[PDB]
Amino acid sequence: SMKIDVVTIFPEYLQPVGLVDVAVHDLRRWTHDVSVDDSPYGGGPGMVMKPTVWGDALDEICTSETLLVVPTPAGYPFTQETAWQWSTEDHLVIACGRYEGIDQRVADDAATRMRVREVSIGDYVLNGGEAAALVIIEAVLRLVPGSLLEGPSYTRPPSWRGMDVPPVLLSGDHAKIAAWRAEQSRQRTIERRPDLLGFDSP
Amino acid sequence: SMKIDVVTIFPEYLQPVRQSLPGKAIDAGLVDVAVHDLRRWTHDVHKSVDDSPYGGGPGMVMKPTVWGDALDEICTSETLLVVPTPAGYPFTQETAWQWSTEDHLVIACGRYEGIDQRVADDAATRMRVREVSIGDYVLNGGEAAALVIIEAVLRLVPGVLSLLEGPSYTRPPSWRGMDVPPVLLSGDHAKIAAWRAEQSRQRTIERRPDLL
Numbered sequence: 001s002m003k004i005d006v007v008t009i010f011p012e013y014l015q016p017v018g019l020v021d022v023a024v025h026d027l028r029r030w031t032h033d034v035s036v037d038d039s040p041y042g043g044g045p046g047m048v049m050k051p052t053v054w055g056d057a058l059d060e061i062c063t064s065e066t067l068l069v070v071p072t073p074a075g076y077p078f079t080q081e082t083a084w085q086w087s088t089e090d091h092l093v094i095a096c097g098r099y100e101g102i103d104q105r106v107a108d109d110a111a112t113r114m115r116v117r118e119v120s121i122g123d124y125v126l127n128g129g130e131a132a133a134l135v136i137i138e139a140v141l142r143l144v145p146g147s148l149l150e151g152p153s154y155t156r157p158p159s160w161r162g163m164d165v166p167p168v169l170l171s172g173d174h175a176k177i178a179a180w181r182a183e184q185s186r187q188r189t190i191e192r193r194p195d196l197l198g199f200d201s202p
Numbered sequence: 203s204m205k206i207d208v209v210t211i212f213p214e215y216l217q218p219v220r221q222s223l224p225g226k227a228i229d230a231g232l233v234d235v236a237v238h239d240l241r242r243w244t245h246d247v248h249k250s251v252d253d254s255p256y257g258g259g260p261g262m263v264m265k266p267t268v269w270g271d272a273l274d275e276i277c278t279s280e281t282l283l284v285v286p287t288p289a290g291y292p293f294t295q296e297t298a299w300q301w302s303t304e305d306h307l308v309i310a311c312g313r314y315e316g317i318d319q320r321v322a323d324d325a326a327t328r329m330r331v332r333e334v335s336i337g338d339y340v341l342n343g344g345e346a347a348a349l350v351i352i353e354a355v356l357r358l359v360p361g362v363l364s365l366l367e368g369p370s371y372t373r374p375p376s377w378r379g380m381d382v383p384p385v386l387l388s389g390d391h392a393k394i395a396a397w398r399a400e401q402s403r404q405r406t407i408e409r410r411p412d413l414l
């Protein structure tokens with residue numbers, strides 16, 4: 001059983017969402033002035049989300065048992081191992097940042113009370129944490145109770161536009177099929193992800 | 203000026219993209235994102251998009267005939283066809299930069315075990331095709347990957363949307379017993395830059411030693 005709370009200033013973005021429930025919260029619900037961001041101390045372009053409103057939101061939503069997940073391009077990598085680890089958690093809270101990110105003290109303060117994980121879903125830049133939250137939720141939820149790249153897959157018809165399904169796949173020879181699929185997998189891995197086999201990246 | 207077509211059996215999943223597009227960019231004709239239900243191209247009354255895998259095994263494979271028709275209609279020779287797949291080449295910021303100058307992206311979202319390989323192979327004989335993965339985790343299908351790709355690419359298109367960055371701070375200067383690092387308030391901007399560089403170095407070593 002898992003509860004996931006997502007906190008964001010763009011709740012509309014999270015709409016692509018019995019053993020698990022997901023709730024989306026508008027961060028602005030915790031403001032009292034009639035501004036969630038300001039210029040960074042030390043200078044630089046763009047804006048930083050103030051810790052104040054985040055603190056109030058997380059105070060209400062989180063407990064000491066919560067795993068606080070904070071997407072950030074500067075995070076530890078989020079991988080399938082991470083997804084397995086998080087799949088048995090009772091409560092994930094995903095704090096989605098915007099602008100140039102969230103004041104570091106939010107994560108620091110939270111860590112005095114609960115476990116906090118700053119993670120990145122990949123080596124590219126997004127405009128905010130929301131798309132990352134969707135990826136994280138999908139990867140985690142498909143593992144909730146109740147190495148090499150996959151090779152190519154085929155289905156009917158056996159000939160299409162003059163392109164044949166590899167004849168071994170029609171042979172019914174399980175061992176030959178297993179061996180061919182292993183070869184395709186190791187072949188694809190060397191070409192596309194040599195790092196997975198401990199080789200230099202292109 | 204970019205057109206993105208997305209093909210998926212879950213068009214409602216692509217709602218956030220439409221949500222994040224500024225009216226100014228659309229009205230300026232800088233971007234157009236269209237989402238297409240793959241079932242529009244099915245052949246049968248049951249609107250079938252999947253079938254059992256040759257060679258056996260669990261799961262299902264998306265049908266080449268349906269996908270072939272969809273891509274035939276939507277793609278041209280100038281299209282960059284993007285196919286998310288857990289077996290893809292890595293999608294990185296370099297990829298996003300390259301794709302940000304394209305006239306036409308088509309993103310083919312798979313489900314189940316993926317798409318019959320002949321779809322991409324056939325397409326590759328008359329347009330540029332890119333099978334890519336957005337990270338080392340497993341999703342249910344290509345839609346969440348498409349959301350990530352679209353955002354990373356479009357934010358590099360003017361006015362449409364190394365080391366790790368260290369921590370950032372803003373007001374108030376003191377909060378829950380934690381002061382902003384005094385160096386940031388020092389007015390010594392060479393020192394501030396050096397402090398930020400060291401923070402970046404330390405964070406990269408701790409979180410991403412692979413980048414070093």
Ligand SMILES: CC(C)N1CCN(Cc2ccc(Cn3ccc4ccc(-c5n[nH]c(N)c5C#N)cc43)cc2)CC1
Nearest residue numbers: 071072073097098120121122124125126127128129132
């Ligand atoms: C890699 C560094 C060297 N460069 C790049 C980052 N630059 C700063 C910068 C630029 C934009 C944003 C937008 N933003 C706001 C909140 C937020 C949360 C997650 C993500 C996010 N992006 N990519 C991922 N894999 C993410 C995850 N998970 C992005 C977010 C935040 C921060 C600085 C330079």
Ligand SMILES: CC(C)N1CCN(Cc2ccc(Cn3ccc4ccc(-c5n[nH]c(N)c5C#N)cc43)cc2)CC1
Nearest residue numbers: 286287288312313335336337339340341342343344347
């Ligand atoms: C990774 C393999 C070694 N093992 C794992 C589990 N099985 C493979 C398997 C499992 C689920 C799916 C679901 N699926 C259908 C279409 C599709 C497109 C993209 C993605 C996707 N997942 N992760 C990414 N970074 C992606 C991207 N981009 C996933 C997709 C497709 C394939 C078998 C083996």
